Write a protein that binds this ligand. Structure first.
Ligand SMILES: CC(=O)OC[C@H](N)C(=O)O
Ligand SMILES: CC(=O)OC[C@H](N)C(=O)O
Ligand SMILES: CC(=O)OC[C@H](N)C(=O)O
Ligand SMILES: CC(=O)OC[C@H](N)C(=O)O
Lengths: 239, 239
């Protein structure tokens, strides 16, 4: 019954983690209220996602920091998230509170790979601690990482949202927000892109704080740095 | 007890699907027989995988056809595989034998994206049938695709190995090898790369037909086209 007769299309370019763990709840809620809106989604590497929206092959770019290289157009903060190490229940780490930055580098690691979905930090957080960790697997997603944790190739380091008991209950979850700083999931779009009402509603559903007047004000400010500074005293969702 | 004291390293660059559904069985069997071999794995886009091995940041490149662009160095066929459409049990297709190329283009599609893991074929198989299918989601992996099939965004088209009952049992599997031609998973390496004994054993475990004398003969033939023609009368595994 509750249906908006809004006609139009919405092309979303994003990554695995976002489309896997952050998007599906929002996506199904969207198409159930906008049957006349043609929704198109494109998964790819974050460096290719920010190229789709610029060149007009996509409207929004829901990915992590990686859009910062592209000073091409508008960039809005959605939510913060942090990593969590996953180990077998038979692993020495499984038993510790709380693990530490130095105590994690003593094991083989299975993390994210450089640009896709949040890695450094890693290789880089360590640089800070002057550590040289042994990383034997750099994967794009977390479904791959956890499988090679069950295999025993090394200690996995994935997003917290990528772990849930009962979906993955033979694994051990350990918080590492004291170990690694949080990453900021952003949404990339253009000033030329006319923001439709179904677009505003989609953003505020993926990011409650990003209301129309908040979005418009951020667009009004002709700088991503000014936008990122507008939310200085404003708190974001933490996953 | 059964341990080879072979010292050395093995860097493998691959994709999601291979590392997800084809590699883990081989990987665990490898490290259990070569404890002194330092195994390193790198997941990435197929166009970036074939760049890792060339530039020496990886030894083997276990991915699909996409290595053909790179006439840089040796390319060995491992196994054939084909797609299978996944739908909800409440979907019209669920009920049909067997679906057909024309009868699939009448629905919204959720397939692989252009270069990563086997797409065209799609967009291209159709071209052949003069069809213009509505594809609303192009994803890198199949874990993403199936989630958006359960959501109901459209009909999914993934690898057959990406489906298994009891891992994904609320979905309906339909064979499409009569619909789409099979793809060839290849392994990319260099002639300069000295093939260690643990490397030969790894290949013949991932591809039974690729024994040492078969591998050496293919390397001896200084052309990938000659290699691909050597297996003309030789049958490959079919997944
Ligand atoms: C993991 C996740 O919940 O992502 C955040 C989501 N946009 C939200 O509804 O807050
Ligand atoms: C959703 C979450 O975990 O973050 C809460 C956030 N600090 C807020 O109140 O906006
Ligand atoms: C899916 C899969 O089995 O891949 C093929 C594998 N290399 C093999 O053992 O034949
Ligand atoms: C493993 C498979 O399904 O393929 C069999 C292949 N035709 C062979 O005999 O080599």
């Amino acid at each position: 019954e509750h249906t908006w007769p809004d006609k139009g299309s919405l092309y979303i370019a994003t990554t695995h983690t976002q489309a896997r763990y952050a998007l599906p709840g929002v996506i199904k809620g969207f198409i159930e209220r906008y049957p006349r809106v043609s929704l198109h989604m494109h998964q790819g590497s974050p460096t290719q996602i920010a190229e789709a929206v610029s060149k007009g092959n996509a409207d929004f770019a829901i990915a992590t920091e990686a859009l910062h290289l592209y000073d091409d157009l508008v960039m809005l903060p959605c939510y913060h998230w942090n990593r969590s190490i996953v180990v077998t229940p038979d692993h020495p780490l499984a038993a510790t509170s709380s693990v530490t930055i130095e105590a994690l580098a003593q094991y083989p690691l299975v993390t994210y790979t450089f640009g896709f979905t949040g890695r450094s930090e890693l290789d880089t957080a360590f640089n800070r601690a002057g550590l040289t960790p042994r990383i034997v697997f750099t994967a794009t997603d977390a479904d791959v990482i956890k499988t090679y944790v069950r295999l025993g190739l090394g200690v996995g380091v994935i997003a917290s949202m990528a772990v849930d008991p009962l979906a993955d209950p033979d694994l051990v979850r350990i918080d590492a927000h004291d170990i690694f700083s949080h990453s900021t999931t952003k949404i990339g779009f253009r000033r030329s892109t006319f923001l439709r009402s179904y677009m505003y509603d989609f953003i505020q559903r993926f990011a409650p704080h990003l209301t129309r007047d908040v979005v418009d004000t951020a667009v009004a400010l002709r700088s991503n740095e000014e936008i990122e500074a507008m939310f200085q005293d404003i708190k974001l969702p933490e996953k």
